[PDB]
Design a binder for this molecule. Structure first.
Ligand SMILES: [Cl-]
Ligand SMILES: [Cl-]
Ligand SMILES: [Cl-]
Ligand SMILES: [K+]
Ligand SMILES: [Mg+2]
Ligand SMILES: [Mg+2]
Ligand SMILES: [Mg+2]
Ligand SMILES: [Mg+2]
Ligand SMILES: [Mg+2]
Ligand SMILES: [Mg+2]
Ligand SMILES: [Mg+2]
Ligand SMILES: [Mg+2]
Ligand SMILES: [Mg+2]
Ligand SMILES: [Mg+2]
Ligand SMILES: [Mg+2]
Ligand SMILES: [Mg+2]
Ligand SMILES: [Mg+2]
Ligand SMILES: [Mg+2]
Ligand SMILES: [Mg+2]
Ligand SMILES: [Mg+2]
Ligand SMILES: [Mg+2]
Ligand SMILES: [Mg+2]
Ligand SMILES: [Mg+2]
Ligand SMILES: [Mg+2]
Ligand code: NA
Ligand code: NA
Ligand code: NA
Ligand code: NA
Ligand code: NA
Ligand code: NA
Ligand code: NA
Ligand code: NA
Ligand code: NA
Ligand code: NA
Ligand code: NA
Ligand SMILES: [Sr+2]
Ligand SMILES: [Sr+2]
Ligand SMILES: [Sr+2]
Ligand SMILES: [Sr+2]
Ligand SMILES: [Sr+2]
Ligand SMILES: [Sr+2]
Ligand SMILES: [Sr+2]
Ligand SMILES: [Sr+2]
Ligand SMILES: [Sr+2]
Ligand SMILES: [Sr+2]
Lengths: 119, 194, 46, 237
RNA sequence: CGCACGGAGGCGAAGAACCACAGAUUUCCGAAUGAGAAUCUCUAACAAUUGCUUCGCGCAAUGAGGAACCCCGAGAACUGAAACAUCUCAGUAUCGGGAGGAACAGAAAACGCAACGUGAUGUCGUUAGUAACCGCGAGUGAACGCGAUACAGCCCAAAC
RNA sequence: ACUCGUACGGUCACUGAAUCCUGCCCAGUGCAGGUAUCUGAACACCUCGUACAAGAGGACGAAGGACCUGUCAACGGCGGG
RNA sequence: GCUUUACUGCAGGCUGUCGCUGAGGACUCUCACUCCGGGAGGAGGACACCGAUAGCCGGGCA
């Protein structure tokens, strides 16, 4: 909520999580806020995901400002458990990162372009 | 590279600036309507919690406690007292608000033991501290090579005997040399002059 | 006054304690009840 | 010294407490949403032990038996209406905005929906004077011009039991009986008749106060006796 | 066949008595815990607060005691100063909370015989009634070091 | 607590049924109101000082006080020539 | 024990200042906070309450 500056539509979120499911079975993904943060700093992150139901908000707070100065695109997911299942975990995830997509590079590029049109 | 934790830490260096200023303004409204001791699933300051000993494991409990701001809630003398002992207003307690918070939490959870605590802010009338408590009887902790020390019989009610980090600091045990003549090994052995 | 069942048991015991040291104990020890209580002169509990 | 009588008061002991268990009802206004379709018939006229004035027992349309603060000229059989579109008749409760100017009103609310705070004692009334979209000026029984919210409810008419203060008590026994029904320690022993240990005006070979009677507002409890922050004293001048 | 030397009777070579260890039994009240109650009663009980959780009191915890010792809090006054207020009595008496068989302390953001030196911590002897405090009055009062005792060093958080 | 109370109330005091009455004094003390001007602490602010600090000074100025007024069924006073 | 314009202090009241505390030397606002309302919502509002400090009064108490 405090780190959220734009609302992402349910349709765009469906596209995003589907692209993440095929990113783990082909390319490579980073699961968890610590690994997502290191990906943005190292530059290896292509697209970063962030949950909106994170309590406390401090865990994720830095991602929207850190990604802006590193050129890495970010998208908001409504639920924590949906992002965790999409990353391939039994538990939830506050943040996920796509470190070089696989056979979804065209979809990821479009998601990154649809988010910029939504500010 | 930097950890994600270092960002939670850097935000808490200035709790009146940035996104945290807005967060605390919102959170405190919910906290003021909450109880004296409120168990919370996850810590507000993950970095500080983990730094203090917290683990996302079974038997590790966190609880937020609110204690009132200010000096001693002192009653005026009802008998003869010399001028030096006639004060009410300027008397302050020897235990800090953090230690009062740790004790109140430990009493709400009789079976658990206080590991550590940290500040999560204040408003005009009260202060909030989150206390990390541990279950000495849970096998998830009795087998933990980092936390199983708290399971020993001599660690029973450790907070009430001042064995917490906040306990040891308030007892004046920080310095190992000059200034700690009346504090080490205990305040009591030194005739209560610390 | 109205007595309860427990009060009755206690008063009963006090009455039993009020008996003399039997004749045979005097012969066995080769020669006195110190807990001799009177209803008027002494006072019980409750 | 010893704590004065006014200090023993605040402790709230039996001697200083009101006989609440012998009291009838907390005379508040009814809770209506919006619609006015709440009216009732007066079943009985009872004596209120808390205020020494009469109180009307009313049964409402929805089946609620409540005791209401009775104005003058309200009897058994009479219909009383409570709400916004209520009739401008004596004994009806409607907000100050709907009540016309120059009409004596009683049981006035301070903040809208509290149930009535002002003009509740025997025979008194509040006078409604000025109207506005923001404020309703009411003249309280003391002669004070109280600026109130027009949404504050009030009952039309003067309070019942007028002229109670006109007849003297005559004897101490009558006072005794009245006081046994209130939250007051009675009789009153003068401070000037006490020992120094008991009151600031106590002591002396004869009866007179110690220092002057007009005490400062800033005076602590135990010393604040006599004429509290008096602007003036006496009759003349 | 207790204290306790009686009368009657009985037990013991089927090895009793007696002693050591272990076990059985172990009413009611009592932290007292199903609810109530001056040791009793009324109609299935971890009451209350917690952790885990199959989310069910299913598995666990706390409570109270103990000669003093120990640790954390609250904290007088008589008294001394030939009065008395700071000071002193004294962080004493007393009070609240809590652990153990011992507590507490403890591996340097130390010391500072200033060194090319020491090397976790208690404690004992000393340092010393020294430094320091103080209506600079009365009084108060360490430490480093040294000689001893005993010695033991380690684990996280983060980086990856 | 007063208070299931709301000034026809209830708090704080004085006097002490009724009847006839209750003079003069506000200088002191008390209480209260006002106040151009004067006085009036700390914080922040300005000058000096200190590579910082202690510290010295200035500006501003609350209640309060000075000053003015009201008040004796307020404490009290009602003399000498 | 008691008194007071005895000495020294301690409560308490009044008052400034700092924190809570926010947006656009006088003013507007609403988002904290307070109160009323069962609720919707209404009043008030960066004040008040509370924490801290400073000046005044302060036999109420030691
Ligand atoms: Cl503990
Ligand atoms: Cl009366
Ligand atoms: Cl050395
Ligand atoms: K003394
Ligand atoms: Mg010791
Ligand atoms: Mg017999
Ligand atoms: Mg009422
Ligand atoms: Mg009268
Ligand atoms: Mg009575
Ligand atoms: Mg009288
Ligand atoms: Mg007398
Ligand atoms: Mg006498
Ligand atoms: Mg007195
Ligand atoms: Mg007289
Ligand atoms: Mg007189
Ligand atoms: Mg029972
Ligand atoms: Mg003395
Ligand atoms: Mg002396
Ligand atoms: Mg002397
Ligand atoms: Mg000393
Ligand atoms: Mg040293
Ligand atoms: Mg008389
Ligand atoms: Mg309320
Ligand atoms: Mg005195
Ligand atoms: Na505990
Ligand atoms: Na000290
Ligand atoms: Na008897
Ligand atoms: Na036994
Ligand atoms: Na149990
Ligand atoms: Na259970
Ligand atoms: Na002497
Ligand atoms: Na003396
Ligand atoms: Na001194
Ligand atoms: Na005068
Ligand atoms: Na005496
Ligand atoms: Sr989760
Ligand atoms: Sr315990
Ligand atoms: Sr007798
Ligand atoms: Sr009400
Ligand atoms: Sr009311
Ligand atoms: Sr007198
Ligand atoms: Sr006159
Ligand atoms: Sr060693
Ligand atoms: Sr008369
Ligand atoms: Sr005057």
């Amino acid at each position: 909520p405090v780190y959220v500056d734009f609302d992402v539509p349910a349709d765009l979120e469906d596209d995003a999580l589907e692209a993440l499911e095929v990113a783990r079975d082909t390319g490579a993904v980073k699961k968890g806020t610590n690994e997502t943060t290191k990906s943005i700093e190292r530059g290896s992150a292509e697209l970063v995901f962030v949950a909106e139901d994170v309590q406390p908000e401090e865990i994720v707070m830095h991602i929207p400002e850190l990604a802006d100065e590193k050129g890495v695109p970010f998208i908001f997911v409504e639920q924590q458990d949906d992002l965790g299942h999409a990353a391939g975990l039994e538990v939830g995830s506050a943040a996920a990162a796509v470190t070089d997509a696989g056979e979804a590079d065209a979809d990821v590029e479009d998601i990154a372009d649809k988010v910029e049109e939504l500010r | 590279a930097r950890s994600a934790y270092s960002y939670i830490r850097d935000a808490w260096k200035n709790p009146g600036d940035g996104q945290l200023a807005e967060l605390q303004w919102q959170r405190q409204q919910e906290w003021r309507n909450e109880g004296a001791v409120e168990r919370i699933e996850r810590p507000t300051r993950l970095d500080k919690a983990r730094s203090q000993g917290y683990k996302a494991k079974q038997g590790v409990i966190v609880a937020r406690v609110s204690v009132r701001k200010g000096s001693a809630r002192k009653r005026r003398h009802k008998a003869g007292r010399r001028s030096k002992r006639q004060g009410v207003t300027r008397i302050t307690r020897r235990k800090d608000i953090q230690r009062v918070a740790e004790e109140r939490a430990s009493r709400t959870f009789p079976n658990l033991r206080v590991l550590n605590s940290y500040s999560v802010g204040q408003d005009g009338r009260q202060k909030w501290h989150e206390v990390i408590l541990i279950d000495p009887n849970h096998p998830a902790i009795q087998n933990d090579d980092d936390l199983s020390w708290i399971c020993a019989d001599d660690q029973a009610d450790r907070v009430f005997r001042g064995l917490t980090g906040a306990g040891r600091r308030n007892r004046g045990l920080s310095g190992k040399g000059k200034g700690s003549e009346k504090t080490r090994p205990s305040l009591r052995s030194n005739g209560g002059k610390g | 006054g109205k007595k309860s069942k427990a009060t009755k048991k206690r008063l009963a015991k006090l009455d039993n304690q009020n008996s003399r040291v039997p004749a045979w104990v005097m012969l066995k020890t080769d020669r006195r009840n110190h807990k001799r209580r009177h209803w008027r002169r002494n006072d019980t509990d409750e | 010294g010893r704590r004065i009588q006014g200090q023993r008061r605040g402790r709230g002991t039996s001697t200083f407490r009101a006989p609440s268990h012998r009291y009838k009802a907390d005379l508040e206004h009814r809770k209506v949403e919006d619609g006015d379709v709440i009216a009732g018939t007066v079943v009985d006229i009872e004596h209120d032990p808390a205020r020494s004035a009469p109180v009307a027992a009313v049964e409402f349309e929805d089946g609620d038996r409540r005791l209401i603060l009775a104005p003058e000229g309200v009897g058994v059989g009479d219909e009383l209406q409570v709400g916004v579109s209520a009739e401008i008749a004596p004994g009806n409760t409607l907000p100050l905005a709907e009540i016309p100017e120059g009409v004596p009103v009683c049981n006035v609310e301070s903040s809208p929906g509290d149930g009535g705070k002002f003009a509740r004692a025997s025979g008194v009334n509040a006078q409604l004077l000025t109207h506005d979209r923001n404020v309703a000026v009411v003249k309280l029984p003391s002669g004070e011009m109280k600026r109130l919210d027009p949404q504050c409810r009030a009952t039309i008419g003067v309070v019942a039991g007028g002229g109670r203060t006109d007849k003297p008590f005559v004897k101490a026994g009558n006072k005794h009986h009245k006081m046994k029904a209130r939250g007051t320690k009675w009789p009153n022993v003068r401070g000037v008749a006490m020992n120094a240990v008991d009151h600031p005006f106590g002591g002396g070979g004869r009866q007179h106060p110690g220092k002057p009677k007009s005490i400062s507002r800033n005076a602590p409890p135990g010393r604040k006796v006599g004429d509290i922050a008096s602007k003036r004293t006496g009759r003349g001048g």
